[PDB]
Amino acid sequence: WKIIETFIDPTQLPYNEKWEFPRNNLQFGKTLGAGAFGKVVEATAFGLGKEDAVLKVAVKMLKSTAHADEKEALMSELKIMSHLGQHENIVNLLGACTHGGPVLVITEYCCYGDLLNFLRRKAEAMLGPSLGRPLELRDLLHFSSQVAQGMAFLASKNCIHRDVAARNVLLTNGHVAKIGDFGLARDIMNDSNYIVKGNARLPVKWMAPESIFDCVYTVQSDVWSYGILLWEIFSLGLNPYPGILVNSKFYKLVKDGYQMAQPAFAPKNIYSIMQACWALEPTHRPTFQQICSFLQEQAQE
Numbered sequence: 001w002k003i004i005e006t007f008i009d010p011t012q013l014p015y016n017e018k019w020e021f022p023r024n025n026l027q028f029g030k031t032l033g034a035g036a037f038g039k040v041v042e043a044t045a046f047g048l049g050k051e052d053a054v055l056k057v058a059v060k061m062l063k064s065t066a067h068a069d070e071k072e073a074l075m076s077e078l079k080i081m082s083h084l085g086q087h088e089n090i091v092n093l094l095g096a097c098t099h100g101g102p103v104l105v106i107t108e109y110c111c112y113g114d115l116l117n118f119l120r121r122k123a124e125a126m127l128g129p130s131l132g133r134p135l136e137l138r139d140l141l142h143f144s145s146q147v148a149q150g151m152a153f154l155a156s157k158n159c160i161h162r163d164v165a166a167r168n169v170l171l172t173n174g175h176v177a178k179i180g181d182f183g184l185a186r187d188i189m190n191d192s193n194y195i196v197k198g199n200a201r202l203p204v205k206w207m208a209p210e211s212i213f214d215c216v217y218t219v220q221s222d223v224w225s226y227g228i229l230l231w232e233i234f235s236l237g238l239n240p241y242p243g244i245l246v247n248s249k250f251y252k253l254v255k256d257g258y259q260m261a262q263p264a265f266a267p268k269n270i271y272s273i274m275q276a277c278w279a280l281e282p283t284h285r286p287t288f289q290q291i292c293s294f295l296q297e298q299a300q301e
């Protein structure tokens with residue numbers, strides 16, 4: 001992710017101690033996710049926030065394999081979450097522990113986990129009787145609308161996400177979707193969705209051609225990625241470009257205008273908005289506000 005002012009150096013942002021929470025008032029539980037150098041662990045926080053709440057939270061932290069560069073990355077994430085401010089459809093910051101030990105970033109806990117796994121498990125549950133309630137089209141529209149609203153919020157704050165994907169969306173109480181980024185708490189090195197391109201491990205099947213070829217990241221490239229996310233939703237969590245190897249031919253195909261076919265559960269106008277997100281000319285793609293407008297109408301019927 002990057003925020004525009006040229007981009008802002010997140011290392012230079014301020015940490016405001018309004019967020020500080022005593023680490024001794026966390027009681028940790030199970031690990032929710034881990035990468036090479038970082039992890040997210042559930043905890044109970046005692047006396048968190050204005051209301052001195054006692055609640056289940058998620059805590060992002062470094063593993064013993066981390067060094068100073070990963071400390072700095074986690075601090076950058078903390079500062080950017082504080083800078084962007086709060087929204088219903090993002091993963092919100094609740095606190096941090098920066099004094100007296102390793103940096104802990106306390107966020108909302110989202111009881112249904114990531115959207116991709118949720119859709120995959122739900123599909124299996126829905127096939128189970130032949131082989132709570134089932135998903136309906138309206139649910140898929142609500143998830144889509146919710147992520148779009150989170151993205152419109154981020155875009156309104158000059159934030160470019162750069163890893164929009166169902167795997168970075170969580171579902172909380174009421175199955176409300178929230179966009180975030182697992183970041184260091186994701187094991188990208190062993191994840192088939194991140195491909196070696198140069199020095200970096202990149203989610204190439206989600207990426208706009210201008211991001212792949214010219215390393216340009218804009219809000220318009222996030223819209224491309226959102227189109228791919230829509231395809232994930234309306235396929236109930238198929239892998240994009242299924243069965244296709246990422247090589248120079250895939251790279252050329254997408255630059256030449258190849259698009260995935262309509263997923264099984266997309267109405268025609270949802271497939272059309274996917275296609276619109278995949279316009280080769282970035283300025284021809286919809287904005288997140290246009291997507292929100294459209295999806296709010298579709299979801300409220």
Ligand SMILES: COc1cc(C2CN(C(=O)c3cc(COC[C@@H](O)CO)ccn3)C2)ccc1OCc1ccc(C2CC2)cc1
Nearest residue numbers: 001032040058091107109110111112113161168180181182
């Ligand atoms: C996904 O992103 C984040 C996640 C987090 C953590 C991970 N959490 C969870 O709540 C959670 C819950 C479950 C439960 O699963 C139970 C099921 O398996 C049972 O069926 C599984 C995995 N994770 C929040 C923090 C910051 C996160 O991102 C912070 C962030 C927010 C905005 C930005 C913008 C782009 C700059 C960057 C980073």
Ligand SMILES: [Mg+2]
Nearest residue numbers: 050051052053
């Ligand atoms: Mg009180």
Ligand SMILES: [Mg+2]
Nearest residue numbers: 047049050052
């Ligand atoms: Mg208090």
